[model samples]
Target chain A: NIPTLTLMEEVLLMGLRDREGYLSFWNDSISYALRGCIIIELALRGKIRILDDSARKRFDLSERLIEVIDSSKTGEVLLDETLQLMKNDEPLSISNWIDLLSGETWNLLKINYQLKQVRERLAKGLVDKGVLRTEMKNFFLFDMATHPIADASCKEAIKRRVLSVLVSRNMELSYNEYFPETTSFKIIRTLALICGSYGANVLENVLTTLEYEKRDKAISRAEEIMAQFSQYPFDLEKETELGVSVNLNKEVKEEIENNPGHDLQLEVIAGVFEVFSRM
Target chain B: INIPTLTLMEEVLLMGLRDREGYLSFWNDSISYALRGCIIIELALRGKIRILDDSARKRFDLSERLIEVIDSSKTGEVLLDETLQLMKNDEPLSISNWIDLLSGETWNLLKINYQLKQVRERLAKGLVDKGVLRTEMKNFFLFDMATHPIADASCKEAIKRRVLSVLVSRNMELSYNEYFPETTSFKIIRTLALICGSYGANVLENVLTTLEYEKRDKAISRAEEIMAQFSQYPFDLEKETELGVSVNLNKEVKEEIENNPGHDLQLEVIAGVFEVFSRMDML
Candidate 1:
């Protein structure tokens, strides 16, 4: 499958350049970096167009038409060069054309934000089929630093309970089981959201309504764990892992290995308090 | 396989505390964090027990016995607790006993330097290994950002030549590539070093060297194109696509991909440069 950030960055740059006509002032390298940065920001915001139908529409226009559209609009530093690339009659294949265009755009995006964007831009998606776990090793220090429920001495049963619930609901627990110090309360809460009923119900609902007499163990186990988690307070704490946690689906675990749903987790933690106020 | 930084951090912290009689302080966290900070400082300096063996040992403990025996010491971090936990009882392991006995002296030669005196702690040697072509993506970025080779064109060419030697010797070319801009000059130099000769010379070297052959041809085309790049510098936003040089590797390439240096080209590149970036951030 097409890589995530690469595709997203290409789309945004093409759209911006074709519509706005501005190119980033940085070199081709810098522009590519910037494209990566912006795409990551967008992805974290959950604005990524994953469906092929919508995504293709974004890139449907000729490179020249896209550039014209971007140029006619307001200035966008990263998008301009990509538009320029599109207009050129280079012998570049579609894939190479997309990569080079995106690369140039990302190069510009770098100056506007931190380099973590490059790492995140390349992160795999929920459905990504490949394993990038070993691939991104040196890219970022993705230590799974998580705080535990109550404290380390808490009942292992409570941990299992909380963990099961979190898993059922598709939560990503931040157990700083290994790197204890860096793990924080915030991580635990975010993971709870990811695993909590709100996010994974789609899967649960899908599994529950299925016609098969026998259910998938994964889905059933998830339901059991999630039900238990619903009883915990919003400020639940979970232990962290010394190494990357292997409990979750290998794919999802790898992506969260670094990003950790930082903003979403923070919001969930706050939302818990909001729910408490209503209660 | 560079000893994961986790282990290195352990050593440096132990060394710092032992050196200072468990009295040193850092700006953040408690003792553990302080230990981390200290180890971090040494890590920034690229601490190596093999190279700075005695000096590193001395930094942890000044006892004559320590000075002599610790000549081969690799770690500054002590794992008395870890080993103790692994023991059958509240009982300590043999190494623990040796240290415990050493702890009896008023000087407590082992106490002060307990954690920092690991001499034989095994470390993963060399760099990470590449699993596939996509893995190579990190190398380009690393090569760009690293220092030595990027400081100037000649050094870049030398590094390139050296890398070519290994790739040619290995009979490999770009089987996979990732193009990112974070690469610094120092990183490129380090990557070139690994690429050129980190692993033993083999078919992998031959494949890479072949790249130099192709680069030789493309360099001329690129040199002519460089002027065009400058003329078109800050080129129009209306139209243009950057050209990338991608490499293909065959069965021999696949074998090289499956085997060769432990360094995952992408991860290693990320790690090498990130080490520098982390240094920059720490500053």
Candidate 2:
């Protein structure tokens, strides 16, 4: 069950309640944030990018054109489907694509392009992996499908990695069996944390074991990380506030340093969060 | 229940309300106008309206961008929907002009009829309707006036806590409150608090425990920066201003901005309303 997950999967898994197997019912922003996660996951896989043009300079970072640079399938169905939507059509601005994919746009013509039942579909994948077990639970009104956690070890590893990233003082990330010693997942892990923090109540869900003020401070640290890295060229040594310290910055820079497609992948990740923040 | 929790204007009134006397002060001239602006701010926050989609709106000031109704559906609140009805087909006006016209401050002769009458009284009645306040009659010998005193303490208590939490801009033991779920747009509510506190000066004085004049001035300056910065479409917050005034943003507000990012300009208009309230004070 300890698998190398994509940003969308990690973000969704991060938000899933261990016992309930559902996200917070109140999270209206999570849908759009999950859609944004699809873009970040695509970027991390080097499947898409923000278009480089003299014409794009006038737009906001999130408003820049997003183009599918790689035409190949990303192995994940939702990712591939979303990639096809961009690959087949004219390049849409990052903000426009997020709006279209989340079905928030007034443009009714593109509503069909909106991703449907993303949570359930993603849950089905988790069920297939045995990370969750599917069952039909009945409310007083009717029976509905549910996926309670079949493996606590998976969610446990995800939560620990997240806490180490945002809460631990020094570089507390353990190079263990779950989060292996590698430069690969640092940026993507942080991206999932950022995406989780914004949309799915993922960060809050994971941090529920902590009391109020501690939870606030941990999330505040994530906010600091988000604001810093969400810029192009990516702030490696971004300054955090006094009480807040996140070692993930240098750890992230370890992978992102002089790498990751000229920081264009980094740029696309930043662009996704920038668009997520305003969504 | 379409309008769910307390309206922004309702919270502002709750901020200004004297819990025992159930009335706001007379010297507070800015609250009424700011409440009108609050109506517009809340309408946009609730997504009944938005900035028109013209590329030319990019050049206009935040207040001057022509706003349009996205949904003509009732907000289930009478005053908000009545305002929505007024804005439905009328020549789309700038947020500033709408505020001016709603406050009956517009100098244009023909647009004078667009005024929203007796907003304060109507809102007071609305609160009474909500059971948070109960109506009472007061006689100053020559005249009798209807006044609503707090019939419910929990709502007012929660709002005062919310206002204090944002203003103190620090971790407090009272940081946990249920009035705002994680779903509520924190930026919109925080901006509304800033506008109301700045305009309804009496509210803060009554609710705020004494703090150093140091945090006080920094708080106002920080709010000024938020208005200047967040009022723009796709605002640039990364270029951290050098003022070093340091309003010390709490974690919740930071997370709120990230979570509820859709209404940047609507937040700007609310900030703009705070500025209008400031200019009114400057006058």
Candidate 3:
């Protein structure tokens, strides 16, 4: 019943467990990552693309603004809403969108959005698709419900796709060979980092279970990719400024010149990481 | 078992406590103000004081309307007796000044004696005596905090009914006997519902508008002055602020008020009270 789950569902499935079905990440942080995942997935689907510097530096392409190449529907309600939010006249950057979705902005105004219950909604979707099943358990006075895995094969396939990039050393491997056509390994790698950064027990268990040589390679590659961003996920100063503007302090100004439009993947990775770090 | 009539403070304390857990949540921002409001309303109900328009014009004075030795007589309640003693002084203070005074502040550098000191313990003791609450101590790693969990849920139900009746009444009159039962009960409860995150401002808008002018103006104007003083809780510059004076009711109270049956209409009373207080800032 895998009818192409949204990035949110896939990421959620990766973090959840069969017996105990809550993501290891903090509940508040999950909303931000889920929102960022939507933005990244939208870019991967060619519905949005980051504007190049050849057009303009600060005149319009203000670091976080992504060009809406195609406004076609993604069919997912949450994704479409995010798309609609991005397409609004407000001119929010990726960081601003992340803040809006994560409810950082609403926190100041004493308002709340429905993003917190995104996990339950997606889990129910998985249950309807027969990929998961709901089981109710009694917790003394309170009745608790959990979603347990119904199909083991579905997750095993996702694990293989995720581990391929972690274990692979060849820098120039064709993106099509490793990931499905029109999908990015960069996105998957960023998602894996997000889960790992937030201390996902499932991801840890999967990493430990890998064969000896592959485990070492995965660990080293994970650390290397983590260090590549320069900005750690949990850095407080960088986190507060996310989705707003990538302000180059005197120290970071050199990096901006070396790379005109900073790697959007790193921006997304940092943005996603900031959510967990702050939590 | 016979359950005695609870005071405004005791009811506010019960609403603030978590059932079974027994400890008050330190995060609540309204409990302190509510406790102070209880004292003001209790004084008003006993006819020991009234909100009279002083020479200051719009601001209502918490003037000693009458002096009665019988009124200040011990009712065997600590909080009521304490507030009655304060009103015995000859100096007249305004409504906001009374809230500020009870909130532990006063004019002319005079020290307020009972500034919500041991409020929880006293309220909990009252409830315990009435068979409504049981005392329990909880360990928080280092120090132990005392909690008062509900012994009888019926006590809370009775209070809820009383509060709701005033909200549901067609006439919307602010009478001490029919609504408050205890002179100060309705006023303090109304004050608590307004300032304690009850979202009372939106809920009680029409109720205020429909009220007969004299009652409405008097009740609302009194509420506004109290709220103006109340806004200074936890940060009152007049005196050294205490932690207990600034805290609000626990999450349970807020949730109970929000989810109660016919809560939408009941909340209007709180909202009406809030709107009155909010306008005080503008004036």
Candidate 4:
């Protein structure tokens, strides 16, 4: 996809990669750097859409377009664009303008939908790119941002969004309620959440929608819907336990009745039937 | 094979091989400890008295001997009843004893051959036996004392020891000469000539035996030895010159040619040898 990498952003990141990336790369710091570079490029280019205008408005013009503009006076373009849109009495669509302001490409390098692939590529690319000295935290956060959201697993994506917020904002989650394994899964799953209305991707979308005074509700609704399926895994059988026992067919029932203990000829409950109940 | 470990030594030494006469044993700390433990157990408990001490010193002790007890401290044995015929008047043979001063039957089972294993076990044993951890410095010194001089490469070991002490600082050499390949072997040789024997293995040996001792008048002996082998290396060889001629055969002629050695030959010889010989011979 055509990623809008401003020359400054590219230079800063390239410099970061060249100067800092070299140090970390030799000591096996590729994963962090690959993810960080991708995220920073995306964020500076406005690929990430933050929905919280209340939060977004607080950021100075420089913060908003730090990587984009060649000069400080470029703030007028954003103010003028918003004023012109308002003068037309148009109900501006943030998602529509998000495509323009952020230079959103074809969501290239699918780190969103296929969560597994994103993680794999992230690890592989770090080594491939040979980023040496970049801070791993930035890289990890970036990887989380760029991970693809699965079309089918939208709810799972939302749950991941909550996790990313916690992680990025450095918020705490209830450890006793969630298993460590579940939390880790949620952290990775949160990356997928970013692709949709949940996680970092959701945050990006929210920010995008907020810009045009629209899409905020839609982003929240999308996240709320996704949060329902967040607790469980994608696979039904593995996620849920067996339901009530099923009666065997005529011959099987007879065989089961004849066997017990070592030769257990018993009716068994299928896990597939119990998935809805378990969730 | 338990050596009375010294607390002041630098490294832990392993105990190994015993003489056939049940007299004394020789061991290397560098070798495997499990093997050393095996020898220690086999020598102590096996019903037959097989291994013997080769170098035994005799001395008269005031205390009476305990036969059942095993004390390795006393070096030799004395026969009170057997009268001497014509043997030297100062013949009181040193006895090798394996007596347990400690009360436990199982304490004898602890024959540590490896420093790591010994440290781990000793950590546990010391906790059980004495209730405090032993200092690492003491353990290393004791281990180092167990090192016996074997005839195979004793001189080389001596040279290394001398170098370890004199030719190089322990820490600097560890980084530059020992670990880093860039400054090792050839680089170190050149670096050594400029210093006033500040640190180095070869230099230490030179100053100690030839200079300080004043025993040997040959101050240039080492340099001359280096001259003998200089023909193999080109002192003035540039990276781009070539000479197909082999100068390895004749020493004097080889030195002359190498002094004006071809740069190309020296530059590409290492890689060329592997390419022409190694690849060609590979199965």
> Best candidate per TM-score, number?
2
Residue B222 of model 1, lDDT score: 32
**All candidates: TM-score:** 0.18, 0.46, 0.38, 0.17
lDDT of 3: 0.47
Which docking category, incorrect, acceptable, medium or high, applies to candidate 1? incorrect
lDDT of 3 by residue, B6-101 (tens): 665665654445455544233233455545655554454444454332334323222222223224566567887776677665455544455556
Ordered list by lDDT, greatest first: 2, 3, 1, 4
Compute the lDDT for candidate 2.
Answer: 0.66
lDDT of 3 by residue, A10-99 (tens): 667766654454445434444566776676667555566554334433432222555565777887777777776566534456556666
Q: iRMS of every model, one decimal?
A: 14.6, 25.4, 13.8, 23.8
Task: Point out where model 3 deviates above 4 Å.
Answer: A1-3, A22-27, A52-63, A105-116, A168-202, A210-216, A226-279, B1-283
Range of the 10 consecutive residues with the lowest summed lDDT in candidate 1 chain B: B124-133
Worst 10 residues of 4 chain A by lDDT: A264-273
RMSD of each: 27.8, 26.8, 23.6, 27.8
Q: Write the per-residue lDDT of candidate 4 for residues A1-279, one digit (tens) a residue.
A: 121211112212221211222111111122222222232223322323223234434532112211111122223223233233323332222232232233332445422221122323332333333321122221100111221111222222333334334222232322321123233222222222232212222133223314432244334433432332322121212211111111112322343244323110000011111111121
Candidate 3 Cα deviation (angstroms), residue A102: 0.9
Q: How many collisions between residues are there in candidate 4?
A: 62
Q: Per-residue lDDT tens digits of candidate 1, residues B1-283?
A: 2322223232222222211212111212122222222232222222211112233332321111121111223343343233222222222222213323322212545344334332222211101111110111222211122111111223223334434432333332321122112222223223322331211111112223334556644433332232232122121223221223312222332343245333232222222222222222221
Docking class of 2: incorrect
Rank by TM-score (best first): 2, 3, 1, 4
Lowest-lDDT window of 10 residues in candidate 2 chain B? B138-147
DockQ (0 to 1) for model 1: 0.01
List TM-scores of chain B, every candidate: 0.19, 0.80, 0.53, 0.18
User: Stretches of candidate 1 above 4 Å error?
Assistant: A1-65, A69-119, A122-279, B1-122, B126-283
